[PDB]
């Protein structure tokens, strides 16, 4: 096989004795990228103001966020300097090397400001038109309010501030496509308020973090794209 082929090997010394992937000196074995990809990382972080929401703005969406196992497309503005100096996370970088996937994501949505009953809902097949989220008044007529019978979840920001949910993989096809260009992905995730708590005069600060589920798998290893060093920022 041409990728791993090694002709005429000239090796001066023996090979180095093994630590069982670090289990000898540390306690754990770092043998796999799928375990590194299950440590949570930031996904999208935004603010939402009154007045760029709906007119009536009782139980409505605040964000429809597209679920991609690679990241959303990043733009490194001056508001969140994360996306600027840290570039992408470890998950978009691991993901850019594989072609397909099959499996779900885990999310952690931390929506505060607001401190009322907030809700989340997964539309497994309404994909996949764009690489940004859509805020408030710009989400389309039929993604505006909650729907009936889509898998959803509800939480009082008074009891607890963090919603942690796991999105299933519901698709007709064999794979979902990593590195899509722009029914390929995991569909949409809608986040929204449950009935018109008055909004603080600055912001509802939402931030989504994500990871890989347990049954998730990266599937066909082609190359990595060209990278950019973070220390050059």
């Amino acid at each position: 096989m041409e990728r791993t082929f090694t002709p005429n090997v000239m090796q001066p010394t023996p090979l180095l004795p093994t630590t069982n992937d670090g289990r000898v000196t540390f306690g754990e074995a770092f043998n796999d990228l799928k375990d590194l990809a299950r440590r949570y990382q930031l996904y999208w972080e935004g603010t939402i103001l009154e007045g760029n929401l709906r007119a009536i703005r009782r139980n409505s969406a605040l964000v429809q966020l597209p679920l991609y196992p690679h990241g959303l497309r990043i733009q490194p503005d001056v508001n969140n300097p994360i996306w600027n100096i840290m570039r992408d996370g470890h998950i978009p970088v691991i993901s850019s090397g594989f072609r397909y996937f099959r499996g779900g994501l885990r999310l952690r949505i931390v929506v505060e400001g607001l401190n009322s009953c907030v809700w989340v809902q997964h539309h497994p097949d309404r994909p996949s038109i764009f690489s940004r989220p859509i805020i408030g008044r710009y989400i389309a007529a039929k993604d505006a309010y909650r729907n009936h019978a889509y898998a959803a979840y509800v939480q009082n920001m008074s009891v607890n501030r963090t919603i942690e949910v796991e999105v299933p993989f519901y698709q007709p096809g064999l794979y979902g496509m990593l590195n899509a260009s722009d029914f390929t992905g995991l569909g949409d995730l809608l986040i929204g308020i449950e009935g018109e708590q008055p909004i603080p005069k600055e912001g509802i600060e939402i931030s989504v973090y994500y990871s890989i589920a347990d049954d998730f798998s990266f599937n066909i290893f082609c190359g990595f794209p060209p990278m950019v060093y973070c220390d050059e920022t």
Binding site: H123, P124, D125, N147, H148, A149, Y150, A151, Y170
Partner: peptide, 15 residues
Amino acid sequence: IAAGDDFEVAVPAQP
């Protein structure tokens, strides 16, 4: 029109 013997439905959605 009626469903055949092998007909199956998939994922609950907005009716």
